Amino acid sequence: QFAKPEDAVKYRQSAVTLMASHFGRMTPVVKGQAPYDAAQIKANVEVLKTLSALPWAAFGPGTEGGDARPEIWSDAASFKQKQQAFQDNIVKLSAAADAGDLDKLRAAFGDVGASCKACHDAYRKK
Amino acid sequence: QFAKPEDAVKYRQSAVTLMASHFGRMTPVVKGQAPYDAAQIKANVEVLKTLSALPWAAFGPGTEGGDARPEIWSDAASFKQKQQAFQDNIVKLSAAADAGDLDKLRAAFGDVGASCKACHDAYRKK
Ligand code: HEC
Ligand code: HEC
Ligand SMILES: O=C1O[C@H]([C@@H](O)CO)C(O)=C1O
Ligand SMILES: O=C1O[C@H]([C@@H](O)CO)C(O)=C1O
């Protein structure tokens, strides 16, 4: 859907800004510093689920740029596995949010966060 | 969810970048220049539906900036009505996509586009 490669870079950077806000806005809730409203978090995690699928289609072939390391394209199977791990962790976070269980939420949230950091450590320019 | 007002501006600009890409990538389909796959468009419009709700919460009180006109906050009822119109047009686009009807899709897509332009004409700095 991108007229030029720069358009894919702009799209993915926007997508990761959104996904990051929908993840990180739950930090105070997971830490107990903000109240836990199960419905609020269920709805938010549904948004995060949709957003979490979007960046990956904007690393198509030819969209080299931004802070994406080139190893994203040359180790395509290894990058796909960091992305799949992250998405399966998002499924576990959805399950926790749907269950309305703060303990389960905290654990799943930590797993998600670890998966974000693991991909950045390998595939995001420093 | 924004530590500072600048964070709301960054979020909404990212949100409108995503929503714009998910809307505008359907232009070739509506024009017949790309094939119409009803399932493909149904899925895409589900993403657009989620995205289309996101910008509006990032014009909270105090988030003046970017290319948002100040009349967004001082004519809050009038801005809310441009946003509601746009969201009700998104509902009609969802219905068309769910029905798998290209004629209905084209008509709904045009209504959505008009609603985007009408809000920009009033509320987006030139
Ligand atoms: C690979 C499988 C990743 C996962 C999982 C996550 N992120 Fe990511 N992120 C990745 C790349 C390759 C890039 C660079 C994109 C580009 O083209 O520039 C990013 C970027 C971000 C950014 C922007 C940082 C900046 O300097 O602007 C943020 C804020 C970010 N990523 C956050 C984030 C979060 C919160 C994730 C889990 C919830 C997450 N990322 C996962 C690769 C990958
Ligand atoms: C008000 C009810 C709006 C509707 C409906 C739509 N848009 Fe919008 N848009 C609006 C504002 C107030 C702004 C500025 C945001 C800021 O703080 O800067 C925008 C911005 C955009 C942009 C970015 C333009 C730029 O110069 O970067 C785009 C690409 C954009 N809007 C597209 C868009 C589309 C495709 C819409 C319908 C599908 C749409 N907008 C609706 C206000 C409103
Ligand atoms: O909200 C965020 O969480 C991850 C990471 O900090 C988790 O360790 C990340 O990159 C963000 O922007
Ligand atoms: O894709 C887009 O459609 C609207 C408008 O051009 C429709 O008239 C807009 O602002 C876009 O970025």
From Swiss-Prot, chains A, B:
Annotated keywords: Electron transport, Heme, Iron, Metal-binding, Periplasm, Pyrrolidone carboxylic acid, Transport
One Pfam family named in its UniProt record: Cytochrom_C_2
Alphabetized Gene3D superfamilies for the sequence: Cytochrome c/b562
Positions with a binding annotation for heme c: R12, Q13, D67, C116, C119, H120
Gene Ontology BP term (one): electron transport chain
A GO MF term: heme binding
Post-translational modification: Binds 1 heme c group covalently per subunit.
Subcellular locations according to the entry: Periplasm
Gene Ontology CC: one annotated term: periplasmic space
Subunit-structure text: Homodimer.
Record function comment: Cytochrome c' is the most widely occurring bacterial c-type cytochrome. Cytochromes c' are high-spin proteins and the heme has no sixth ligand. Their exact function is not known.
Descriptive protein name: Cytochrome c'
